[PDB]
Design a protein around this ligand. Structure first.
Ligand SMILES: CO[C@H]1/C=C/O[C@@]2(C)Oc3c(C)c(O)c4c(O)c(cc(O)c4c3[C@H]2O)NC(=O)/C(C)=C\C=C\[C@H](C)[C@H](O)[C@@H](C)[C@@H](O)[C@@H](C)[C@H](OC(C)=O)[C@@H]1C
Ligand SMILES: [Mg+2]
Lengths: 158, 38, 83, 7, 94, 1112, 227, 158, 51
DNA sequence: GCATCCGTGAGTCGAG
DNA sequence: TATAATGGGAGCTGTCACGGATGC
């Protein structure tokens, strides 16, 4: 679904998706605070949905801070089929995508789906952030020309 | 992509293949068969 | 000798790559007879083995780079000045 | 069933 | 875009070298509990929580900023590995 | 409200029963209502007639059959997971030749599934539709030789798996060659075997260009039919001894055997018409008076040489022509499999006749039903043409039944399918729809039967045409095959008529598909209606003439995906076909005769007719469809109401007062909104969720079995080890969740405890056990729990148990428990909406009502569509629908605008004018003049050349409203949108692709057995696939460690993934990954292939990746 | 159903008297633009300020005429006069006529205007005109108190036959830009964050400007009192 | 910015260009009658005529837009490059144009209707051939494209 | 050590016998009752390993 | 030298 | 643990686009 509000480097990530994706980190940061005595307690606490509480969301927000995920839309035709975005927790089950990268994925809003991957180590996260960040690739490795550029509504208004 | 010198270690082959392949679905069936022929 | 992309692919040195591409029986038998070794020069090979590919952050060129702060650098410098 | 998603 | 990314791409002969530098530095910071940081207290990256501002938990952010401050030395064959390990352990226990 | 209809076209005949293809095909096949002596030879009757009599000596013969009554009714079959079917009994008589002993008995042949009223089947509890198949009609064809331009290829094709194709070709050397079973041999030889002599072929074929001399061979006529036969047998059968009777038997089996080689009745007729001859049997030759006699080959060779010579009255054939392509319906397919099974039964019967007691044998002791049962069952369960029913809405089922597939057994294989097959042939007109098909791989291979189209007894598709004699159009209708259609000049249906007479001097018509302008003196026939050109889905798109064919396709397809809504409405602009579709799908309940309604209940409707009889109609309520949509009927009448014959009683699913309801009529504004509708995304008003527009009920089935084990029995129980009362709160005494309890992910639907596998406690477990002093229980908790992302209210529980009346399960299973969970889904971001014109999008934003663009009178709009979606796609139908929709919004009336005959611009403008009066004159009467904002907007529109300068504000507002545009205020500002905006009612549907179903994520989960990699699918809580192309992506980015993570740490490196997880939860960075298990598997597989895979170092000295475990 | 709401925290960020940023968070859904738009309208349109309405220059017949001895044409001087920021220290004073006389090789700035009682020139270094040898400039400018923006052709005021009406920019506010960003308090992610940005000429500070704006609005809410 | 049905503007010039065309058609027809032109010659001439006519009415639509209605939504979206190209817009306000037989041969009788005026059943069915062929093209070429990409990757990957 | 190379070659019958932990002399898989591997069968624990 | 035969290829994720 | 019994059946059909091997 298109977020208009997203900065070029950002993507809307559903809360539950992020919770499950980042789950070990969330357990760790839950033990770091007083939310749970230990890891296992935290996991058993997250297992049921009616056991979920306010503090855990702020905890998750602390967890994902500075981190990025990878968005990929099949088919991946060229390098930009995967791009790195800083996740922003959103209400709803839909992933929010930034308009300018659409042309790069050949994505539109008619019901296309995308996949999220979480790079784990410091190395992978560094690679993602420096090399694969959407805002960092502005030009076609193919033609050299601009890749993320105004289209549709934007060009219209301007 | 960066409009500057290529960084050593950049994998060129995959980039070339992808760059040639991506527009391929915009060519019909002298078009795509000519490309494959070449 | 000019050969098309497929034959050129199958004709490469790395038998892992050729075997992953196509004509698996042919490639593999011709590799087994001659007792071929795969030096793992290309990407596909190391991908199959699950190693760090020889490109980007996995290129020998930039991968051995070290980083150190001036404090620790000078401490180690004094350790070197002692001996 | 395929293309951009009629069915 | 990562803050001052252009300068970082300027610092190195290859972008991937920058990547390796930042990753390694970040691992150092994680392992030594941030004690080894070259950043003054006022330069510390901040995460804004419910209570107030706190230290940014993200190691990579730190490493990139440290790198921007020019207070780091990066290159091949600076010091033998076990020596660097033992020394960093000496100055900053873990 | 008043429904105003447009159009001047008068339909002579209505649409035929839409399911007639299915129902009439199957009925024709079974003849269950026909008394045995009156049965025509067709279908299973014909199968019996072919198989019997059986010889070799004893003789088993066929008399008649009978089909009994179903052991269980349809609903009961659906619930008990049975098959709705009737017993098949067969009267046979065993006859000993010598003894003269005759024994007559009725043997039980197993069961034949019955077709339900709506034209579907129930197989093993599931609703299945048998999809009719399109193929190449049997007969004789002549097609141009691709290599040799001057020459041709003759082909003789029988029914599928009814025996081999035959190719007659004139070779470069001059001899005429025949190809059978991929064997080329001179046709002369076969001609000699048939008993032809050189004289006969000389006088018959002599008139030609001396191609006949290529058929002239002296060595062939130098041998009698016997010698020629043995010669041919030696030619076709290398290594097989050339015995006389064996040769006669083989060649007879290949050519003259009706039991083996069979042309269709279609092939019969077609061969007759093409070759200009008359066939006795359905074979190519006969065995008569000890020898062979030729029916076919000589006429065929004659026509071939006559085509080669250039003789007038001889032509090639179009295999894409619908005169040359036919349809095998349900009955023909089922009968085919029945014939196969019967053949197997005959083989078994003979085998049983050879040995065994030769005195005492009965038809019961000879006949085993097993092959026939296994055959029919194979067809209904595993055939590609037997398909899980599409139940999404009634239109889905109806369309599914009308599907024409080129795939399946004997049919085409895609990736083998060319462009010519997928093309729309000129003869598709009135027969197969040019529009409705898939976008993807199957395009042109799967199609839809046209609305007025019919399938004849021969299996060819026919379309109706009105007779025209001397410029007078009669009411006499004639259905034609494409071949017969080619013979006439057929005028278009929109051509002017005064009374029954053609009112135009120049009339548009067709000759062999080619458009031609003729005089009324020349017109033989005229189109029944434009409706006949398209399918049922396509016929539901109003203003279709304004839509590009591709978007028409998209909308057409998309209607099938419409989800039944609790509030669902009929479209404001209909095609007039909305009612028939509901009526034929048997979704809605109707009145059988005239009468009075005695009772009205939510569960039932009781009706007294003129017959004085009380007929009670029960209502299906909240049943789960195959696609999970809730199919329920609701009563539309009241106590005492008088009802004539055919009046509506209960409203089916996706139906409003008898009209087809696929969605809601919402008030739309077409303007860009803050990038929220960017790239086909859609913005909706929260007022839609408030009043429950686009809200749908969905039901999901959960099933669990408790069985007997060698470790002890599983049991459904409320007693679950290590669980609190908090977790057992909603569980009843037996352990089954109660009806009406709300269940969320993690909840227990059904409790179950399984005896633990034999377990050696790890030392830590033993020590901890000593510390807490608690016995380790013998049973563990296997209880069926609500999957992630699922949940709802529990509306039903079914419990079956072994040792209970009427209940027997599969061996080893003690009990089966089912829980039905229904959830009520509102609309939410990520759900897919679409119109009928091919505009499709996902709701990207739900704004509060105050943010929504509104009319001057304070009325907000439900949906904001993006204008950018219109021009590129070229579907203008939605625009007109919107305009007329605006009119209908203010006049409070709906419309019917049939395709190609419908409301045109001027009439829409009149309606919009009246609407303007209602929308404005009221306001003037209310004592409110023109707003300042309306002045600004009017200045703008005046600059845009939209309105004529100098007019009063009211006049210009009317001018805009007539163009379908109104003044709109932005809800956030209060300022007007600088231009006037197009606003109006549009019919939009909620498609079955819903974000609630599709969203999934996983950290860690189950892994595969051999590969040790994460499972696929959301149901399995598996991971996303990172494929070759994603790997290429990462490589091009040159992210090495990310890629290495994907290849190792995240999947299939055991030690690595365990270590990584432990590290992350500990707060430690992830460890260096190791060798992925799938490579170890590769190595071992290669070793199993007798190849040695050695991982070395740079020293060429072996490195052991198995860590010694594999080496002695 | 049962609702809790905390009073938002007003955040101020100011650079000199020329600019400021204003952040109000958290706000209830939709209330970002509910307060935002009105204040924008009120700020630009209704905030009290001073402008140059009319100007007379000796030996100058009309607006597009050229002045011998001066490089800028009359039009360019009128423009420079539009950017003059004049502050009235006395609330009683509705109008002033500022006289300026100069000649010779000198570049006239806003300082050269002869001082008037309770009239402060905020931008004395502002450029008006440059004169060469033999060039003369004799002018009188009419400064009135007013609100918003009034074009010359709208007021059409003249003290003299040769006096030229000038488009009067009264608004001390040069620009208002506001944006509402989604921010979260605890569980709810949609809660509104209002960020407001205001430009001024220095005569009235942005904080003063916004306070005046909310006062005008609040007073209007009292107009619903007595029928 | 919006789209009403009146926003597709059928130029007057169209009618003229049609009548003239008809006239020329007749001329060519006469040329066939007396045997000056062969069948294929006449066919080619008619095709050329209709091609040039189509071009002409496209230019007529766009000139009408440029001069008379510069802010007309179709024209705006086209010119800005936000949506649409001259041919599509021409189909909207102009004539639909020449149509292909399933064989690839072109019909002599072009659709004279815009999507605004609306097509006639025979016209629609005539066009469906083209639509189907195009759609099948799109569906079939994805596979071969993919195959090519894979071959290229495998040959260049080291 | 680090793996820098991968070699493939024809395996000698002696090498094949060297890999093998035993010969499978029986077609049997597991027992129809105990559901445990048979002796000298494809699943035998004697050869391939402990379950 | 040039017709002819046999084997091997023929897009991606999703659900199934 | 003993009349004598002595050569099997099903094929399965609208793809090219070929590559190198094999054949007058
Ligand atoms: C048993 O057949 C299976 C495949 C056999 O293999 C193959 C090789 O032969 C066929 C035949 C003979 C067909 O006609 C197919 C067909 O018409 C398809 C798609 C296919 O792939 C078809 C296949 C094959 O792939 N397109 C449609 O039908 C479209 C135009 C409308 C209906 C869509 C709904 C969603 C379905 O109807 C669905 C409810 C379900 O019924 C099918 C998905 C069914 O799956 C099952 C469980 O029944 C398929 C067809
Ligand atoms: Mg899409």
């Amino acid at each position: 679904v298109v977020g208009p509000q997203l900065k070029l480097h950002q993507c809307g990530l559903p809360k539950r998706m992020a919770l499950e994706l980042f789950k070990p980190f969330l357990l760790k940061k839950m033990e770091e605070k007083g939310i749970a005595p230990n890891v296992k307690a935290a996991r058993r606490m997250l297992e049921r949905q009616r056991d979920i509480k306010d503090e855990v969301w702020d905890a998750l927000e602390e967890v994902i801070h500075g981190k990025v995920v990878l968005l990929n839309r099949a088919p991946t035709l060229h390098r930009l089929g995967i791009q790195a975005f800083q996740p922003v927790l959103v209400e709803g089950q839909s992933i929010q995508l930034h308009p300018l990268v659409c042309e790069a994925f050949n994505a539109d809003f008619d019901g296309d789906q995308m996949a999220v991957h979480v790079p784990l180590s410091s190395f992978a996260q560094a690679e993602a952030r420096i090399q694969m960040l959407s805002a960092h690739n502005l030009l076609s490795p193919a033609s050299g020309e601009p890749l993320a550029k105004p289209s549709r509504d934007i060009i219209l208004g301007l | 992509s960066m409009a500057r010198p290529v960084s050593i270690g950049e994998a060129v082959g995959i980039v070339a293949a992808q760059s040639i392949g991506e527009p391929g679905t915009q060519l019909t069936m002298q078009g795509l068969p000519r490309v494959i022929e070449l | 000798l000019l050969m098309g992309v497929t034959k050129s692919a199958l004709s490469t040195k790395s038998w892992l790559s050729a075997a992953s591409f196509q004509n698996t029986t042919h490639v593999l038998t011709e590799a087994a007879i001659a007792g071929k070794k795969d030096e793992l020069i290309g990407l596909k090979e190391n991908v199959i083995l699950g190693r760090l590919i020889p490109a980007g952050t996995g290129s020998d060129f930039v991968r051995f780079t070290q980083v150190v702060d001036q404090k620790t650098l000078k401490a180690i410098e004094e350790a070197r000045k002692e001996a | 069933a395929x293309x951009x998603x009629x069915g | 875009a990562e803050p001052g990314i252009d300068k970082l791409f300027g610092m190195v002969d290859s972008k991937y070298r920058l990547t390796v530098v930042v990753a390694k530095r970040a691992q150092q910071l994680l392992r030594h509990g941030f004690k080894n940081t070259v950043l003054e207290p006022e330069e510390r990256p901040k995460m804004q929580t419910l209570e107030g501002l706190f230290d940014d938990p993200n190691a990579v952010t730190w490493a990139m900023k440290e790198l921007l401050t020019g207070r780091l030395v990066f290159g091949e064959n600076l010091v033998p590995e076990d020596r660097l390990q033992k020394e960093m352990e000496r100055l900053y226990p873990v | 409200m008043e429904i105003k209809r447009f159009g001047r076209i008068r339909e002579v005949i209505p649409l035929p029963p839409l399911t007639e293809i299915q129902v009439e095909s199957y009925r024709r096949a079974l003849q269950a209502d026909v008394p045995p002596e009156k049965r025509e030879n067709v279908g299973i009757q014909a199968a019996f007639r072919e198989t019997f009599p059986i010889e070799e000596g004893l003789v088993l013969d066929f008399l008649e059959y009978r089909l009994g009554e179903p052991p269980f009714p349809q609903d009961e079959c659906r619930e008990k997971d049975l098959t709705y079917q009737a017993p098949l009994y067969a009267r046979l008589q065993l006859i000993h030749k010598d003894t003269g002993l005759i024994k007559e008995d009725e043997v039980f042949l197993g069961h034949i599934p019955l077709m339900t009223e709506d034209g579907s089947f129930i197989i093993n509890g599931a609703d299945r539709v048998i999809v009719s198949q399109i193929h190449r009609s049997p007969g004789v064809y002549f097609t141009p030789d691709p290599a040799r331009p001057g020459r041709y290829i003759a082909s003789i094709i029988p029914l599928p798996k009814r025996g081999p194709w035959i190719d007659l070709e004139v070779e470069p050397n001059g001899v005429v060659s025949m190809k059978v079973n991929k064997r080329k041999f001179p046709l002369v030889l076969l001609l000699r075997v048939l008993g032809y002599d050189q004289e006969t072929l000389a006088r018959e074929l002599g008139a030609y260009g001396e191609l006949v001399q290529g058929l002239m061979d002296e060595s062939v006529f130098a041998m009698r039919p016997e010698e020629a036969l043995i010669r041919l047998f030696t030619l076709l059968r290398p290594g097989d001894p050339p015995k006389r009777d064996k040769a006669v038997a083989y060649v007879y089996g290949l050519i003259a055997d009706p039991r083996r080689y069979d042309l269709g009745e279609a092939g019969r007729y077609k061969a007759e018409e093409k070759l200009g001859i008359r066939l006795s049997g359905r074979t190519l030759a006969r065995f008569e008076d000890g020898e062979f006699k030729d029916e076919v080959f000589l006429p065929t060779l004659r026509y071939l040489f006559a085509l080669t010579a250039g003789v007038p009255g001889h032509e090639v054939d179009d295999i894409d022509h619908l005169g040359n392509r036919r349809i095998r319906t349900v009955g023909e397919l089922m009968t085919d499999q029945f014939r196969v099974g019967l053949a197997r039964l005959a083989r078994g019967v003979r085998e049983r006749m050879l040995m065994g007691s030769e005195d005492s044998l009965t038809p019961a002791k000879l006949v085993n039903s097993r092959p026939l049962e296994a055959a029919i069952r194979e067809f209904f369960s595993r055939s590609q043409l037997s398909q899980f029913k599409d139940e999404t809405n009634p239109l889905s089922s109806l369309r599914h039944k009308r599907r024409i597939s080129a795939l399946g057994p004997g049919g085409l294989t895609r990736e083998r399918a060319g462009f010519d097959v997928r093309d729309v042939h000129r003869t598709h007109y009135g027969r197969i729809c040019p529009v409705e098909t898939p976008e993807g791989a199957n395009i042109g291979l799967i199609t839809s039967l046209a609305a007025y189209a019919r399938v004849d007894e021969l299996g060819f598709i026919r379309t109706p045409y009105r007779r025209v004699v001397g410029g007078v159009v009669t009411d006499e209708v004639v259905y034609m095959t494409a071949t017969e259609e080619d013979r006439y000049t057929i005028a278009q249906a929109n051509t002017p008529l005064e009374g029954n007479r053609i009112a135009a001097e120049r009339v548009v018509a067709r000759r062999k598909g080619e458009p031609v302008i003729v005089s009324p003196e020349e017109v033989e026939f005229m189109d029944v209606s434009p409706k006949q050109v398209f399918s049922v889905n396509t016929n539901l798109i109003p203003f279709l003439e304004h839509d590009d064919a591709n978007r028409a396709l998209m909308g057409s397809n998309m209607q099938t995906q419409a989800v039944p809504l609790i509030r669902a409405q009929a479209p404001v602009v209909m095609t007039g076909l909305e009612e028939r579709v509901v009526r034929d799908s048997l979704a809605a309940l109707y009145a059988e005769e005239d009468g009075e309604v005695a009772k009205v209940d939510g569960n039932r409707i009781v009706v007294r007719y003129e017959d004085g009889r009380l007929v009670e109609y029960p209502l299906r309520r909240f049943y789960r469809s195959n696609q999970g949509t809730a199919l329920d009927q609701r009563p539309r009448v009241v106590v005492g109401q008088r009802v004539r014959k055919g009046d509506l009683l209960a409203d089916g699913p996706a139906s409003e007062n008898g009209f087809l309801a696929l969605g809601q009529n919402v008030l739309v504004a077409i303007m860009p909104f803050d990038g929220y509708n960017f790239e086909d995304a859609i913005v909706i008003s929260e007022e839609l969720l408030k009043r429950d527009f686009y809200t749908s009920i969905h039901i999901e089935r959960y099933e669990i079995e408790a069985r007997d084990t060698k470790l002890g029995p599983e049991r459904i129980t409320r007693d679950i080890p290590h669980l609190s009362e908090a977790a057992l709160r909603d569980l009843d005494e037996e352990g089954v969740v109660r009806i009406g309890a709300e269940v969320k992910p993690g909840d227990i639907l059904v409790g179950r405890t399984s005896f633990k596998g034999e377990s050696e406690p790890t030392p830590e477990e033993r020590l901890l056990r000593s510390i807490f002093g608690e016995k380790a229980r013998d049973v563990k908790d296997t209880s069926l729990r609500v999957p992630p992302g699922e949940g709802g209210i529990v509306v039903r529980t079914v419990r079956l148990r072994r040792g209970d009346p009427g209940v027997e399960l599969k061996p080893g299973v003690r009990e089966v428990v089912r829980v039905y969970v229904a959830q009520k889904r509102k609309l939410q971001v990520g759900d897919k909406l679409a119109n009928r014109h091919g505009n499709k999008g996902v709701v990207a934003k739900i704004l509060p009502v105050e943010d929504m663009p509104h009319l001057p009178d304070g009325t907000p709009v439900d949906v904001i569509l993006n204008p950018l979606g219109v021009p590129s796609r070229m579907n203008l139908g939605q625009i007109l629908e919107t305009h007329l929709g605006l009119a209908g919004y203010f006049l409070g009336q709906r419309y019917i605008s049939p395709i190609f005959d419908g409301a045109k611009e001027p009439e829409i403008k009149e309606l919009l004018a009246q609407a303007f009066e209602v929308y404005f004159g009221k306001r003037k009467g209310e004592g409110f003049g023109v707003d300042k904002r309306e002045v600004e907007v009017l200045r703008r529109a005046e600059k845009l050349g939209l309105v004529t300068p100098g007019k009063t504000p009211e006049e210009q507002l009317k001018e805009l409203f007539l163009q379908g545009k109104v003044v709109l205020y932005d809800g956030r500002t209060g300022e007007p949108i600088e231009g006037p905006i197009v606003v109006g009612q549009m019919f939009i549907m909620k498609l079955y692709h819903m974000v609630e179903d599709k969203m999934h994520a996983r950290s860690t989960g189950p892994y595969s057995l051999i590969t040790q990699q994460p499972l696929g699918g959301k149901a399995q809580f598996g991971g996303q696939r990172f494929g070759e192309m994603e790997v290429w992506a990462l490589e091009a980015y040159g992210a090495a460690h990310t890629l290495q993570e994907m290849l190792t740490l995240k999947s299939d490196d055991i030690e690595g993934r365990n270590a990584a997880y432990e590290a992350i939860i500990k707060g430690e960075d992830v460890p260096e990954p190791s060798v992925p298990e799938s490579f170890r598997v590769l190595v071992k597989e290669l070793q199993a292939l007798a190849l040695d895979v050695q991982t070395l170092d740079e020293k060429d000295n072996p490195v052991d990746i198995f860590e010694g475990l594999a080496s002695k | 159903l049962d609702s809790k709401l905390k009073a938002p925290v007003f955040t101020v960020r100011t650079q000199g008297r020329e600019y400021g940023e204003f952040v109000l968070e958290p706000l209830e859904r939709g209330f970002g633009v509910t307060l935002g738009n009105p204040l924008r309208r009120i700020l630009l349109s209704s905030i009290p300020g001073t402008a140059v309405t009319s100007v007379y220059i000796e030996d100058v017949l009309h607006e597009f005429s050229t002045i011998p001895g001066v490089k800028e044409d009359v039009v360019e001087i009128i423009l420079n006069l539009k950017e003059l920021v004049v502050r009235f220290l006395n609330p009683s004073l509705q109008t002033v006529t500022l006289l300026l006389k100069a000649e010779g090789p000198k570049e006239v700035k806003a300082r050269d205007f002869l001082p008037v009682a309770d009239v402060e020139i905020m931008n004395p270094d502002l450029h008006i005109a440059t004169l060469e040898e033999g060039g003369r400039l004799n002018m009188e400018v009419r400064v009135d108190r007013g609100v918003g923006y009034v074009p010359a052709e709208k007021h059409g005021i003249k003290d003299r036959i040769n006096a030229i009406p000038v488009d009067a920019v009264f608004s001390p506010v040069r620009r208002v830009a506001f944006q509402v960003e989604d921010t979260r308090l605890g569980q709810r992610t949609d809660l509104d964050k209002l960020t407001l940005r205001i430009w001024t000429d220095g005569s009235v500070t942005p904080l003063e400007a916004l306070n005046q704006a909310v006062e005008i609005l609040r007073e209007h809410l009292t107009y619903f009192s007595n029928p | 910015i919006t789209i009403g049905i009146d926003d597709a503007v059928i130029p007057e010039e169209k009618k003229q260009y049609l009548e003239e065309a008809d006239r020329k058609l007749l001329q060519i027809e006469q040329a066939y009658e007396m045997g000056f032109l062969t069948d294929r010659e006449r066919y080619d001439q008619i095709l050329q005529l209709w091609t040039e006519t189509t071009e002409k009415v496209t230019q007529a639509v766009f000139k009408n837009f440029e001069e008379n209605y510069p802010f007309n939504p179709l024209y705006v979206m086209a010119q800005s490059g936000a949506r649409g190209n001259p041919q599509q817009i021409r189909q909207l306000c102009g004539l639909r144009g020449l149509m292909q037989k399933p064989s690839g041969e072109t019909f002599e009788v072009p659709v004279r209707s815009s999507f605004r005026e609306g097509l006639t059943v025979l016209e629609y069915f005539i066009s469906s051939h083209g639509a189907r062929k195009g759609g099948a093209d799109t569906a079939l070429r994805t596979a071969d494209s993919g195959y090519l990409t894979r071959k290229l990757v495998d040959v260049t990957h080291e | 050590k680090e793996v820098r190379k991968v070699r493939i070659a024809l395996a000698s019958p002696e090498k094949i016998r060297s890999w093998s932990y035993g010969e499978v002399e029986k077609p049997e898989t597991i027992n129809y009752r105990t559901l445990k591997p048979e002796r000298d069968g494809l699943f035998d624990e004697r050869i391939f390993g402990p379950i």
